[PDB]
């Protein structure tokens, strides 16, 4: 049975740093954990898979190589993303009373 399609929208959690450092302790601990180099494939996979499973948002293959440090992972997971349609975006962009937008799609 195919699971229902997942929404691509993702709002970063408020306790993002705490969750990330907990996962870092689980995977790898030392001071300045933000600079822990993700050069080991095993540890990189463990951390990224745990984060993806927890947050419902995974690092795309394009950015996977540039996620070189825990700081980079934190930046990627704190930048938000939205999946609303263009119609929804235009309608929610505070249209003035004299502007009407409709789709025949």
């Amino acid at each position: 049975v195919c699971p229902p399609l997942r929404s691509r929208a993702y709002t970063p959690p408020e306790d993002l740093q705490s969750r990330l450092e907990s996962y870092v302790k689980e995977v790898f601990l030392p001071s300045n954990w933000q600079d822990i180099s993700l050069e080991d494939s095993r540890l990189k996979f463990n951390l990224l898979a745990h984060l993806a499973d927890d947050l419902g948002h995974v690092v795309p293959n394009s950015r996977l190589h540039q996620m070189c440090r825990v700081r980079d992972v934190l930046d990627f997971y704190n930048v938000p993303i939205q999946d609303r349609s263009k119609f929804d975006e235009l309608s929610a962009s505070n249209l003035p009373p004299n502007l009407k937008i409709t789709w025949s799609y």
Partner: protein
């Protein structure tokens, strides 16, 4: 050519400037497409400029309809009933913005040859010339060679 084209006289819809200026444009219908390279500029205009234009011109109702289209269009309806349809097909955002602003600033009168660059409803203040202006009057109104 002028002889092969209709012509009119310079005029305003309702003496548009005497009491108060009224924007003649009233409706702007943008037929755009979600897909299609022709309406890429129209899509960008709808995204970035149409809202600003709408709030700048509160007297104009703008209807943006996104439906499958090969030639995106803008239909401008003016107060006088004139309807002008323009193609925004393969036009950049700047070109579409200039076209829309021109439509907003343009009246609904037909874009045809204008016979005179001016129009006065009171051309004369001192009295239009007639042959008897600048002609002296004679005693008892006697025409030339009249005996009595």
């Amino acid at each position: 050519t002028a002889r092969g084209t209709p012509s009119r006289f310079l005029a305003s819809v309702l003496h548009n400037g005497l009491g108060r200026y009224v924007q003649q444009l009233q409706r702007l219908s943008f037929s755009v497409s979600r897909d299609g390279a022709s309406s890429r500029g129209a899509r960008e205009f709808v995204e970035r400029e149409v809202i600003d234009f709408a709030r700048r011109n509160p007297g104009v109702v703008i209807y943006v309809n996104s439906r499958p289209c090969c030639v995106p269009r803008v239909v401008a309806e003016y107060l006088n009933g004139a309807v002008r349809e323009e193609s925004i097909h393969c036009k950049s955002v700047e070109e579409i913005s200039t076209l829309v602003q021109k439509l907003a600033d343009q009246s609904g009168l037909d874009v045809i040859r204008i016979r005179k660059p001016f129009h006065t409803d009171n051309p004369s203040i001192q009295g239009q010339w007639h042959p008897f202006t600048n002609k002296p009057t004679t005693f008892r109104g006697l025409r030339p060679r009249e005996v009595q």
